[PDB]
Copies of this chain bind each other. A is one copy, B any other.
């Protein structure tokens, strides 16, 4: 097995976050593209397990299948305090 890497036209190897053709990918310090949950500077993001792209404004099923986590439009995971569920059930996040 192995991993995916990315090098811009100038030969620079991508490490960390990198916008690649309208999508965002996260590479560890060695350049290896990461998939799944990633904690970057005390903040959580979710990278598609298939093509590795960051998911945003979406709900992703918990591991224990007990519930869902919401990823804000910028990709960051929303905390409980950020939610305001209105009486009818409308889920709002800040």
Contact = CB atoms under 8 A, between A and B. Distances in A.
Interface of A: 1-10, 14, 20-21, 44, 50-51, 59, 62, 66-70, 77-80, 82-83, 85-93
Q: How many copies does the complex hold?
A: 4
Given A2-B7, A2-B8, A2-B10, 19 more contacts: A1-B9, A2-B9, A2-B14, A3-B7, A4-B6, A21-B50, A51-B51, A59-B68, A66-B92, A68-B90, A68-B91, A70-B89, A77-B88, A77-B89, A78-B89, A80-B85, A80-B89, A83-B85, A85-B85
Contacts of A5: 4-7
Given A2-B8, A6-B3, A7-B5, A89 B85 contact: no
